[PDB]
Design a protein around this motif. Structure first.
Motif, mmCIF file in Angstrom:
data_model
loop_
_atom_site.group_PDB
_atom_site.id
_atom_site.type_symbol
_atom_site.label_atom_id
_atom_site.label_comp_id
_atom_site.label_asym_id
_atom_site.label_seq_id
_atom_site.Cartn_x
_atom_site.Cartn_y
_atom_site.Cartn_z
ATOM 1 N N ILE A 239 0.854 -1.187 0.000
ATOM 2 C CA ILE A 239 0.000 0.000 0.000
ATOM 3 C C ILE A 239 0.887 1.233 0.000
ATOM 4 O O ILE A 239 1.883 1.276 0.716
ATOM 5 C CB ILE A 239 -0.932 0.017 1.219
ATOM 6 C CG1 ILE A 239 -1.678 -1.300 1.423
ATOM 7 C CG2 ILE A 239 -1.886 1.177 1.102
ATOM 8 C CD1 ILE A 239 -2.699 -1.582 0.343
ATOM 9 N N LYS A 240 0.524 2.229 -0.803
ATOM 10 C CA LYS A 240 1.251 3.487 -0.778
ATOM 11 C C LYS A 240 0.620 4.416 0.264
ATOM 12 O O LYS A 240 -0.566 4.743 0.171
ATOM 13 C CB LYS A 240 1.250 4.151 -2.156
ATOM 14 C CG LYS A 240 2.259 5.285 -2.261
ATOM 15 C CD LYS A 240 2.179 6.100 -3.531
ATOM 16 C CE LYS A 240 3.308 7.106 -3.639
ATOM 17 N NZ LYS A 240 3.201 7.919 -4.876
ATOM 18 N N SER A 241 1.420 4.866 1.238
ATOM 19 C CA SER A 241 0.924 5.786 2.251
ATOM 20 C C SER A 241 1.241 7.234 1.886
ATOM 21 O O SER A 241 2.351 7.555 1.481
ATOM 22 C CB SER A 241 1.458 5.447 3.597
ATOM 23 O OG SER A 241 2.863 5.476 3.591
ATOM 24 N N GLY A 242 0.212 8.081 1.993
ATOM 25 C CA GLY A 242 0.345 9.528 2.064
ATOM 26 C C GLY A 242 0.291 10.047 3.509
ATOM 27 O O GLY A 242 0.631 9.332 4.454
ATOM 28 N N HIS A 243 -0.139 11.303 3.666
ATOM 29 C CA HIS A 243 -0.023 12.006 4.934
ATOM 30 C C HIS A 243 -1.061 11.486 5.926
ATOM 31 O O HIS A 243 -2.240 11.391 5.603
ATOM 32 C CB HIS A 243 -0.186 13.518 4.739
ATOM 33 C CG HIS A 243 1.033 14.190 4.194
ATOM 34 N ND1 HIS A 243 1.008 15.447 3.629
ATOM 35 C CD2 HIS A 243 2.312 13.764 4.117
ATOM 36 C CE1 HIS A 243 2.230 15.760 3.226
ATOM 37 N NE2 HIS A 243 3.043 14.758 3.526
ATOM 38 N N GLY A 244 -0.588 11.126 7.126
ATOM 39 C CA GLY A 244 -1.465 10.695 8.207
ATOM 40 C C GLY A 244 -1.617 9.181 8.300
ATOM 41 O O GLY A 244 -2.356 8.686 9.151
ATOM 42 N N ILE A 245 -0.877 8.467 7.451
ATOM 43 C CA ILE A 245 -0.932 7.024 7.339
ATOM 44 C C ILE A 245 0.500 6.495 7.360
ATOM 45 O O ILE A 245 1.377 7.056 6.710
ATOM 46 C CB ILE A 245 -1.654 6.622 6.038
ATOM 47 C CG1 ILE A 245 -3.143 6.973 6.068
ATOM 48 C CG2 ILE A 245 -1.422 5.154 5.722
ATOM 49 C CD1 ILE A 245 -3.959 6.091 6.984
ATOM 50 N N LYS A 246 0.700 5.425 8.132
ATOM 51 C CA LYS A 246 1.920 4.653 8.154
ATOM 52 C C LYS A 246 1.537 3.240 7.712
ATOM 53 O O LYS A 246 0.443 2.753 8.024
ATOM 54 C CB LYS A 246 2.513 4.671 9.572
ATOM 55 C CG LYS A 246 3.854 3.962 9.761
ATOM 56 C CD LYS A 246 2.984 3.745 11.682
ATOM 57 C CE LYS A 246 2.153 4.927 12.137
ATOM 58 N NZ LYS A 246 2.946 5.876 12.953
ATOM 59 N N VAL A 247 2.436 2.599 6.962
ATOM 60 C CA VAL A 247 2.238 1.232 6.521
ATOM 61 C C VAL A 247 3.466 0.445 6.943
ATOM 62 O O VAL A 247 4.572 0.842 6.607
ATOM 63 C CB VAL A 247 2.019 1.156 5.000
ATOM 64 C CG1 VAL A 247 2.175 -0.258 4.472
ATOM 65 C CG2 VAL A 247 0.671 1.735 4.602
ATOM 66 N N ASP A 248 3.258 -0.651 7.680
ATOM 67 C CA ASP A 248 4.371 -1.457 8.154
ATOM 68 C C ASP A 248 3.888 -2.865 8.518
ATOM 69 O O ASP A 248 2.826 -3.307 8.075
ATOM 70 C CB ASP A 248 5.059 -0.737 9.319
ATOM 71 C CG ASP A 248 4.275 -0.792 10.617
ATOM 72 O OD1 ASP A 248 3.360 -1.633 10.720
ATOM 73 O OD2 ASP A 248 4.565 0.028 11.502
ATOM 74 N N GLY A 249 4.682 -3.541 9.359
ATOM 75 C CA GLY A 249 4.411 -4.889 9.823
ATOM 76 C C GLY A 249 3.018 -5.066 10.410
ATOM 77 O O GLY A 249 2.369 -6.067 10.130
#
Lengths: 198, 200, 200, 201, 200, 200
Positions: free
Chosen positions: B82-92
């Motif tokens: 997933i591509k994250s923009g502002h206000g979103i983190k994508v990780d484990g």
């Protein structure tokens, strides 16, 4: 045909015999090459489980494709994409948060923005007509928004009506009284009263 | 070769005839095995639409792969992400909200954390030098942060100068007047309180 | 079999020969058909790179499948879904923000809801037993939550014990002094107000 | 057929394969029947009542079909069937003929007796050397047959013209005379003149 | 099967295609070989005259065999043999002439043997009782068989009765006449011979 | 096609490989069957001599037929027959000796028949006009064919012209001489015979 040209029976038999193992080999290879497609879609008798791989399904006419679940969609160009619900936007920056009232979004993340709601909190805390004294060495701090000095104007109490200007409890209206020579000293600290007009 | 050994003509003809249909069955099966691949990519003449399935495309050299759209990316290890923009983190742990000022994020969701901003709201309501009386049964409640008692120390007002210490409208400095309890005529009631002042 | 029935040597030869090119075409087309599946999984000797296309991987038993990365999960019915960390709800409506304390989430975005936390901000600013005077041009304005009028009931201070009811610094208790209206030489102005006290 | 678009449908492929089955069955039936012809020819077919060569034929041990020669028949040096001739018979380009020997001539009428070869021997078994025969000639005698001469006194031959009367008499060798009369006597003797020949072989 | 092992499409295509002409060559040769037996029996669509060759016929069950005509027979052992009529013998020496009366057959050919018939011929020529004079050189040639001297025994005439023994007359019996040897004018010459007589 | 119907790859491979040996058997048997014709005509690469068997040859269009030698013909019905030269005939009874002049053929074989030539032999021995004395008592044997009695008729001599009738050399004509039975001194004996004469 001249009979002398024709080969011996033994020659002929061996020419036929010698193709057997190349044939079995070619057909073995051809069958294995064709089996690849069936393994790919997970319908081969040789597999542990007769089901497509992770995230895939088979259409009615045998197309292998993405099986979309919660949060995933297919757009108009047959592309895998994200379905956005409340609070989310999907654009070319990717998935981002949609800011509403009292929120601002940025590279730091989702942030509170007091501008949209601090006045409502003030109003739930302090009613219209609240008076507060401000100590100023000469001068008091600045009026905060929604407040006015008690200067007599515009429905507002006048608190420079004398040398001494005091509040007393549990009624409305004005009065005066006189003092001063006696046995009891009263100390006074001068302040500037502001009043909540909103 | 001893001629007595050679089968009859009918045996031989029958031996050839008996393989015809077995052969037909094997070639049929093999062709249908081969066809599976062409079905999978949506290129069979027998399919209504000659297009790959949902989410899929073909490379110019014949590979079947996903076709990434809005918010979807392919990482360096060829995985779908997933591509994250502002206000979103994508990780484990997945897609989460990134907390900024005044926000704390936990399993209840996105939460307001007042520690980051309540002081700023206070300062918009009550300016430096504000004075508030607190009633104390004997003891007043504790100072809120940013406040001190009016005890005459460090520039703060001294509301403990004498027996009576009143605030009066509408200037700066101190003064005194006298009452007379011997030959006075009008009674003033007074409630003692503890004044605190906002020192920020 | 009567020998007159049997075709010429050249007819028999010709029928065998005529099948050679057709058979070659058939085997050519069957091989290329079966090749499609190997092209599709990117394992064809004819391909630059012997790897699956973007987003795909091979299992050990030969299945072509989606390669899930960060934010991407596979559910129990084998579907590609989003993995939600803290802050995020994933359901039929899509990826949404999960609202926690002080947050309300709607079609305008993530919004602050003060009802969850304003009282904690009040208490950080004004302690129990704070008193505020309210000027009522008519009656006063109404009481805020957590407050009560100083009417002498339920342990609250009585600010109508007399005609004049003043606060003084810097203690607890009450007292009275007497002003000399008769022959005093200094006028004191009094604005009457309604004192409320904060009871929480 | 690199491009996927060029590859026939699966049905078309299966139908091209299916189409050849019966033509193949036909072709092989015919090829097998073509091959069986030779085996029938030598009378070794399972489908024949008797597992034997046909009339007059045998098989060699290395599989050749050939004639089986019996009494009177031979194979010549160029492998041709021919006739074996015993006594009396000649076999050549004219066919089978009778070999003529002594006293025989062969021609289109068949075997004939040729007396040239033996008539003298038969004569000699009947008539010895020295036999004399009288020939009546109306004037002249018939001509001398082979092996005879006139009795004219030459080369030891009897001389039967010495006188006007030359008579034979039994039962000796030699010659003599006696006298009669030409006109006087009591008994007339009649004489017929002949020409005597003698066998000189 | 590990997909890396499997040959390229093109490799497989060439493996199949390389067998074409070898296969055609083999079927060509095998058909031509089959055709030999139908040529042998004169039943081939490529022969001008669909007839067995000189001296041959086909049985109804397709055996190729000898067709015997005049003078030719098949013996019990299925051997080609000569059929013989009058005058001929067939045996281990082959075909020979069978000698009858008056014939001797040997290496010179067919010969007349007169011992069997010369007496018949003599009897057709010379009757019983024929007398022939033999000129003796003194002595006469030997008696042929069937003849005896005229010596007066066993009913043979006595041609040595007297000095002179003449044949005469036209009759039977004997007689005598007296020549006048004393006074006769006419000499009569006499040649002596040995008369023989045929007694069969 | 429902992909569940199609059998395993190992099943498919095994079916193709099952047929390999049966087909090797079939083609071997078929090659051996075709070889029988080439063996029969003696053109088989496995034969020591590439020649037809005894008494056979191959036409130029490949027919196996009888090779006729001396004595042997092929008739108008394509049958092997005997060729007859002088002295032989051939018919339903087979080969026989053909009888010419002086010859009779029967079951005893070839015979001399004297009826055809004995007169010619007589004519080579005794010419026309030959005279032979026949002794008989009281009659002579019968005249042989070609002879007549010397009875004075039809140009024959008259040997019954007198009591005594003698032959004398060496001339033609007749005469008489006289004996003297009263006075003669020399006795002549006479035997009476019957003279016949050859009139052919």
């Amino acid at each position: 045909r001249a009979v002398g040209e024709i080969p011996s029976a033994d020659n002929l038999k061996n020419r036929f015999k010698a193709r057997s193992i190349p044939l079995e080999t070619d057909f073995t290879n051809l069958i294995d090459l064709a089996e690849v497609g069936r393994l790919a879609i997970g319908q081969s008798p040789s597999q542990q489980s007769k089901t497509p791989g992770t995230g895939m399904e088979l259409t009615s006419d045998g197309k292998l494709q993405v099986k979309a679940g919660a949060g995933v969609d297919i757009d108009n160009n047959n592309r895998i994409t994200i379905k956005s619900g409340h609070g989310i936007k999907v654009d070319g920056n990717g998935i981002s948060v949609k800011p509403g009232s009292g929120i601002k979004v940025d590279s730091n993340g989702v942030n509170v923005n007091i501008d949209d709601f601090w006045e409502e909190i003030r109003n739930k805390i302090m009613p219209k007509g609240t008076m507060l004294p401000i100590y100023g060495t000469p001068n008091p701090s600045a009026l905060p928004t929604g407040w006015e000095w008690c200067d007599g104007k515009d429905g507002r109490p006048n608190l420079k009506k004398g040398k001494y200007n005091l509040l007393s409890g549990q009624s409305s209206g004005t009065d005066t009284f006189w003092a001063d020579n006696g046995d009891t000293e009263i100390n006074v600290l001068f302040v500037y009263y502001m009043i909540k007009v909103v």
